[PDB]
Scaffold this motif. Structure first.
Motif, PDB file in Angstrom:
ATOM      1  N   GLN A  43      -3.994  68.355  63.702  1.00 11.75           N
ATOM      2  CA  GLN A  43      -5.190  67.667  64.178  1.00 11.75           C
ATOM      3  C   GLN A  43      -5.458  66.479  63.243  1.00 11.75           C
ATOM      4  O   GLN A  43      -4.846  66.333  62.187  1.00 11.75           O
ATOM      5  CB  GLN A  43      -6.397  68.608  64.157  1.00 11.75           C
ATOM      6  CG  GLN A  43      -6.824  69.054  62.756  1.00 11.75           C
ATOM      7  CD  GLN A  43      -7.836  70.183  62.786  1.00 11.75           C
ATOM      8  OE1 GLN A  43      -8.912  70.087  62.192  1.00 11.75           O
ATOM      9  NE2 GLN A  43      -7.500  71.254  63.487  1.00 11.75           N
ATOM     10  N   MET A  44      -6.407  65.650  63.653  1.00 12.99           N
ATOM     11  CA  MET A  44      -6.787  64.480  62.896  1.00 12.99           C
ATOM     12  C   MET A  44      -8.298  64.292  62.976  1.00 12.99           C
ATOM     13  O   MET A  44      -8.923  64.404  64.029  1.00 12.99           O
ATOM     14  CB  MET A  44      -6.079  63.245  63.454  1.00 12.99           C
ATOM     15  CG  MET A  44      -6.370  61.950  62.718  1.00 12.99           C
ATOM     16  SD  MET A  44      -5.398  60.572  63.382  1.00 12.99           S
ATOM     17  CE  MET A  44      -3.867  61.356  63.588  1.00 12.99           C
ATOM     18  N   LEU A  45      -8.878  64.025  61.812  1.00 14.11           N
ATOM     19  CA  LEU A  45     -10.309  63.779  61.687  1.00 14.11           C
ATOM     20  C   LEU A  45     -10.532  62.350  61.157  1.00 14.11           C
ATOM     21  O   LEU A  45     -10.021  61.960  60.110  1.00 14.11           O
ATOM     22  CB  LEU A  45     -10.942  64.765  60.699  1.00 14.11           C
ATOM     23  CG  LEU A  45     -11.015  66.244  61.055  1.00 14.11           C
ATOM     24  CD1 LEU A  45     -11.512  67.005  59.849  1.00 14.11           C
ATOM     25  CD2 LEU A  45     -11.937  66.447  62.243  1.00 14.11           C
ATOM     26  N   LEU A  46     -11.270  61.557  61.919  1.00 12.17           N
ATOM     27  CA  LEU A  46     -11.589  60.192  61.496  1.00 12.17           C
ATOM     28  C   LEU A  46     -13.084  60.146  61.166  1.00 12.17           C
ATOM     29  O   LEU A  46     -13.918  60.792  61.801  1.00 12.17           O
ATOM     30  CB  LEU A  46     -11.288  59.181  62.603  1.00 12.17           C
ATOM     31  CG  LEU A  46      -9.820  58.909  62.921  1.00 12.17           C
ATOM     32  CD1 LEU A  46      -9.723  58.033  64.148  1.00 12.17           C
ATOM     33  CD2 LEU A  46      -9.158  58.234  61.742  1.00 12.17           C
ATOM     34  N   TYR A  69      -1.119  63.669  72.756  1.00 14.05           N
ATOM     35  CA  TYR A  69      -1.477  65.096  72.709  1.00 14.05           C
ATOM     36  C   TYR A  69      -2.100  65.573  71.361  1.00 14.05           C
ATOM     37  O   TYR A  69      -2.482  66.736  71.197  1.00 14.05           O
ATOM     38  CB  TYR A  69      -0.262  65.946  73.066  1.00 14.05           C
ATOM     39  CG  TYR A  69       0.238  65.685  74.462  1.00 14.05           C
ATOM     40  CD1 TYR A  69       1.524  65.192  74.686  1.00 14.05           C
ATOM     41  CD2 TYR A  69      -0.583  65.912  75.564  1.00 14.05           C
ATOM     42  CE1 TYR A  69       1.981  64.930  75.983  1.00 14.05           C
ATOM     43  CE2 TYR A  69      -0.145  65.653  76.858  1.00 14.05           C
ATOM     44  CZ  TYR A  69       1.136  65.164  77.065  1.00 14.05           C
ATOM     45  OH  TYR A  69       1.560  64.909  78.351  1.00 14.05           O
ATOM     46  N   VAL A  70      -2.185  64.654  70.400  1.00 13.97           N
ATOM     47  CA  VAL A  70      -2.761  64.955  69.075  1.00 13.97           C
ATOM     48  C   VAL A  70      -4.317  64.985  69.170  1.00 13.97           C
ATOM     49  O   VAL A  70      -4.958  63.980  69.489  1.00 13.97           O
ATOM     50  CB  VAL A  70      -2.320  63.904  68.013  1.00 13.97           C
ATOM     51  CG1 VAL A  70      -2.998  64.185  66.675  1.00 13.97           C
ATOM     52  CG2 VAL A  70      -0.810  63.926  67.843  1.00 13.97           C
ATOM     53  N   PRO A  71      -4.931  66.171  68.927  1.00 10.85           N
ATOM     54  CA  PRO A  71      -6.393  66.280  68.996  1.00 10.85           C
ATOM     55  C   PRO A  71      -7.046  65.484  67.849  1.00 10.85           C
ATOM     56  O   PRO A  71      -6.721  65.649  66.677  1.00 10.85           O
ATOM     57  CB  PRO A  71      -6.635  67.789  68.880  1.00 10.85           C
ATOM     58  CG  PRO A  71      -5.483  68.270  68.075  1.00 10.85           C
ATOM     59  CD  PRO A  71      -4.314  67.473  68.607  1.00 10.85           C
ATOM     60  N   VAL A  72      -7.959  64.592  68.220  1.00 13.92           N
ATOM     61  CA  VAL A  72      -8.649  63.732  67.255  1.00 13.92           C
ATOM     62  C   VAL A  72     -10.160  63.712  67.544  1.00 13.92           C
ATOM     63  O   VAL A  72     -10.592  63.761  68.692  1.00 13.92           O
ATOM     64  CB  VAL A  72      -8.128  62.251  67.348  1.00 13.92           C
ATOM     65  CG1 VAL A  72      -8.815  61.379  66.314  1.00 13.92           C
ATOM     66  CG2 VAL A  72      -6.613  62.185  67.165  1.00 13.92           C
ATOM     67  N   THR A  73     -10.957  63.681  66.475  1.00 15.99           N
ATOM     68  CA  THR A  73     -12.420  63.596  66.604  1.00 15.99           C
ATOM     69  C   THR A  73     -13.035  62.840  65.393  1.00 15.99           C
ATOM     70  O   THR A  73     -12.458  62.787  64.307  1.00 15.99           O
ATOM     71  CB  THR A  73     -13.083  64.991  66.805  1.00 15.99           C
ATOM     72  OG1 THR A  73     -14.481  64.817  67.068  1.00 15.99           O
ATOM     73  CG2 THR A  73     -12.907  65.875  65.579  1.00 15.99           C
ATOM     74  N   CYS A  74     -14.132  62.191  65.784  1.00 14.82           N
ATOM     75  CA  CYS A  74     -14.809  61.303  64.839  1.00 14.82           C
ATOM     76  C   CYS A  74     -16.128  61.819  64.293  1.00 14.82           C
ATOM     77  O   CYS A  74     -17.034  62.186  65.044  1.00 14.82           O
ATOM     78  CB  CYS A  74     -15.042  59.938  65.482  1.00 14.82           C
ATOM     79  SG  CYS A  74     -13.551  59.210  66.201  1.00 14.82           S
ATOM     80  N   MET A  92      -5.638  63.674  58.122  1.00 13.24           N
ATOM     81  CA  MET A  92      -4.580  64.104  59.034  1.00 13.24           C
ATOM     82  C   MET A  92      -3.958  65.406  58.514  1.00 13.24           C
ATOM     83  O   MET A  92      -3.431  65.484  57.411  1.00 13.24           O
ATOM     84  CB  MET A  92      -3.514  63.005  59.119  1.00 13.24           C
ATOM     85  CG  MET A  92      -2.498  63.159  60.242  1.00 13.24           C
ATOM     86  SD  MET A  92      -1.212  61.884  60.137  1.00 13.24           S
ATOM     87  CE  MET A  92      -2.139  60.453  60.591  1.00 13.24           C
TER      88      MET A  92
END
Lengths: 115, 115, 115
Positions: A43-46, A69-74, A92
């Motif tokens: 996953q990725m956190l911005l 398809y990479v789950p990302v949230t801000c 990341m």
């Protein structure tokens, strides 16, 4: 094993164009330094400081190849008086064999002061 | 397997000294209870309620031994009317064999009301 | 391997009843689509836009069966002018064999515009 890869950058003005340009740049830089394949990304956190409202930094992930398809949230970063202003950061989470001390964290623009 | 370890604490005033003192205390407490080695830590997420601006809680990780390669980032916790004020929380992601029901989550100071 | 599962929803008013009802619904929907067992969940991150203050969305996890040991924490989502208002999102990190392209991310209510 699973490791976190950090990244940070700054923008001069609160505009969609610059935010997306520099966030994209930060991400490509991280992928380049760590040889990151999208299927290995958990996953990725911005995050952005409370002074940026123009656009969601995640919109830049769309310009990357094979990252749909990479789950990302801000999230919003904690407001600390005297902290780095107009900043975009990345956390990341990826699968890798590379030792914690060899992970390449990326700090660009005015965020070099954090390295 | 990978598990999340939670922690929470509170401070009386918004000052660098107290925030760093109690955040450090919270972290040592978590490391003590769970026998956490820095190389096993995937990443760490620190959050503070919107009423703390003195300093980034992560600055305390520097006083720990061998934690310089652990990726850490600070977020702002959701502002909920009537929620715990002046609070610092931790979400430490670590590799461990310890069952989910045996993980030692740490709640200190006025944050004991969350246990 | 470990994968992130995303979810999003919206509420009409800032009240404890609706926030808990729709957050619970979102979570059951995610668990249903992905066949998620609580012991496989590493951690869970809930976020809300800065216009919701009624209650912590995590309070809904209590109504689920066997989810008392799953570490959960609430963050505030980045405030983006023109972004989806009154929104609750989820970033559930779980252990699974299911390929990244087959993970069922859930978007409900007015958050369908994000799918």
């Amino acid at each position: 094993m699973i490791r976190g890869i950090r990244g940070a950058t700054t923008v001069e003005r609160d505009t969609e164009e610059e935010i997306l340009q520099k966030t994209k740049q930060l991400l490509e830089k991280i992928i380049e330094e760590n040889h990151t394949k999208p299927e290995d990304v958990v996953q990725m956190l911005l995050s952005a400081t409370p002074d940026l409202h123009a656009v969601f930094p995640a919109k830049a992930v769309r310009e990357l190849s094979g990252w749909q398809y990479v789950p990302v949230t801000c999230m919003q970063e904690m407001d600390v008086t005297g902290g780095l202003k107009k900043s975009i950061k990345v956390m990341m989470t990826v699968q890798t064999d590379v030792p914690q001390d060899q992970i390449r964290h990326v700090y660009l623009e005015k965020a070099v002061v954090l390295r």
